[PDB]
Design a protein around this ligand. Structure first.
Ligand code: HEM
Ligand code: HEM
Ligand code: HEM
Ligand code: HEM
Lengths: 146, 141, 141, 146
């Protein structure tokens, strides 16, 4: 993903202030609320019946964590996204059957959450860098689909 | 909105499809699974190989929905109502996939309609399939 | 469409935008231009430098149209009719770009309205902007 | 992009049958008829106000043959579509100010025209190959946007 050196810098600096169960949990939870069809993967969770329900779900939170952890490690490999996500891309296609469009939606929600959480600090140039990151991650997770 | 020329072109086109609607449905589905492998994520239970009776039967149903909609072009949200619930409330296919199916239906109609699929008819059929896609996703949230 | 609840949420949130209309519009436009450079293709006749008067003025008009939309939420296609004519007949901006500006508008609102931007409110605003975008593209073809 | 032997073979073979000149006019004409907002770029071609006007316009045919001619030239470079279209990419961004979404629309219309012209020979598998090609060309012509 063609980030500039300073864009990489911006992403990392900002990412240092993120707690993830909180942030991962927040991004996944808002995905399920704003785009509720993504819950299709979530019959198991029972109450996802309201926004407060989704956001407080310990299940959602633990999965947010798992998802952003993977996403966090990709920041260490920004020149190797297809590589670092390949066997993960295969899992999501072969076993989990998740339409890659869901990755794009999560990415936009992750951006919205980051803006909400950091406020003015989430400047237009910072956002643009993160938009490349979330696009690169989605594209890497989609790459082994067949 | 679908114009009266659109509705005319759609009825003329679908009228020419005739009893092959069902067949063109499955073909549209095969085209979609091959051209756009992500759509296969919604059919983990189906054998999606060429010739699959599951694909053929599902194609018949899709082609049949499109038939009712033509039959009722002036009030498509009614004709299709039962069906938008099903997608909005159960199947939960992301909206982006409807453009992919639509494109593949258009390619199938083009491939079988040497005379009928003029630019004007192509234009009307694309608007019709977008309209169907909009009705089918209208209750999604 | 928009439920009574989405209408309530949109009015409440946009109400807090208030006199920051131009600032938030201009900000959203700037977010769009940096995040999605292809959108600059519609504004080669602007100085898109940071701070430019052209971006600030257009920001204002975009936000004022949205205040128009919020204020006439029970009748947006009429309220928006002149603007939908304009994008359909003259500007002719490809519909995909409306998703990109709507996203940057959500981001701007998130960054500025920490209290108001709950998950429920985020959802109603996303639906509202999609509705706005639909009316603005309804006459394209 | 990446095509299987089956796919490259279908692309080459079908295109041997393609009168690029004729297919160009038809594809560009259809783009302007089907997605009429694309007419914003062709104001100097004159009258484009009905399907019959667009499809009978000689500047539309002329330009179509230039577009598809450049597309054709690209099929001989399927493994470095970016390097092959970089110039054109720059031209379309910097001089012509054409939103790359237009390229996706032309690919989808080009696919419809090949389907229409070739009928049953444009099989699902041949379509799939062309879909990969047109999405490649489009990402290539979008690549130098900034
Ligand atoms: C931001 C992009 C994403 C990343 C980096 C990511 C990462 C991961 C990782 C590391 C796992 C570990 C799975 C395991 O072996 O237990 C996982 C599992 C899983 N993912 Fe993704 N994920 C992403 C997006 C999504 C989205 C948007 C959805 C659905 C809307 C989804 C659905 C799932 C499911 C259903 C599992 C299995 C969970 C379980 O069985 O406990 N993923 N993901
Ligand atoms: C032109 C747009 C579409 C139409 C007219 C349509 C119509 C239908 C119909 C008629 C059924 C069966 C209803 C019944 O059982 O009574 C159905 C089911 C289904 N549709 Fe859609 N559909 C469309 C788009 C899509 C798309 C794009 C996808 C995914 C890519 C999709 C995925 C499904 C699935 C997974 C089922 C259930 C199939 C099964 O397991 O039997 N549909 N649809
Ligand atoms: C929320 C969606 C949008 C709203 C509310 C909106 C509103 C407006 C308004 C109020 C104007 C001024 C018209 C006048 O002079 O009376 C305008 C013009 C314009 N809009 Fe839109 N618009 C939207 C989406 C878009 C998008 C997505 C694009 C392209 C990325 C775009 C491109 C333009 C352009 C190029 C102009 C003319 C600018 C000028 O030269 O002054 N619009 N829009
Ligand atoms: C996607 C494949 C396309 C290819 C390969 C392509 C190629 C070309 C070529 C070869 C030229 C002639 C310029 C030169 O080198 O002298 C051209 C010009 C141009 N292109 Fe594209 N084109 C593509 C799509 C598009 C689309 C979809 C649009 C807009 C809807 C567009 C808008 C234009 C315009 C407005 C010109 C200038 C025409 C004039 O001379 O007035 N192109 N392109």
């Amino acid at each position: 993903v063609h980030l500039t050196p300073e864009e990489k810098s911006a992403v990392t600096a900002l990412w240092g202030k993120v707690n993830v169960d909180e942030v991962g949990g927040k991004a996944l939870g808002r995905l399920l609320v704003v785009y509720p069809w993504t819950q299709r993967f979530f019959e198991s969770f029972g109450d996802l019946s309201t926004p407060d329900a989704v956001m407080g779900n310990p299940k959602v939170k633990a999965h947010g964590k798992k998802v952003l952890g993977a996403f966090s490690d990709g920041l260490a490999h920004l020149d190797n996204l297809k590589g670092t996500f390949a066997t993960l891309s295969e899992l999501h296609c072969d076993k989990l059957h998740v339409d890659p469009e869901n990755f794009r939606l999560l990415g936009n929600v992750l951006v919205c959450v980051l803006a909400h959480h950091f406020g003015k600090e989430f400047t237009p140039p910072v956002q643009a860098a993160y938009q490349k990151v979330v696009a690169g991650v989605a594209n890497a997770l989609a790459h082994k689909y067949h | 909105v679908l114009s009266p020329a659109d509705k005319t072109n759609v009825k003329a086109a679908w009228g020419k499809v005739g009893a092959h609607a069902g067949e063109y449905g499955a073909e549209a589905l095969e085209r979609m699974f091959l051209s756009f492998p992500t759509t296969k994520t919604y059919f983990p239970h189906f054998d999606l190989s060429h010739g699959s009776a599951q694909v053929k039967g599902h194609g018949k149903k899709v082609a049949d929905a499109l038939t009712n909609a033509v039959a009722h072009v002036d009030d498509m949200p009614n004709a299709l109502s039962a069906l938008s619930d099903l997608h909005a409330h159960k199947l939960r296919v992301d909206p982006v996939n409807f453009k992919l199916l639509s494109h593949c239906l258009l390619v199938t109609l083009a491939a079988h309609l040497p005379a009928e699929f003029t630019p004007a008819v192509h234009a009307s059929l694309d608007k019709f399939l977008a309209s169907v896609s909009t009705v089918l996703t209208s209750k999604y949230r």
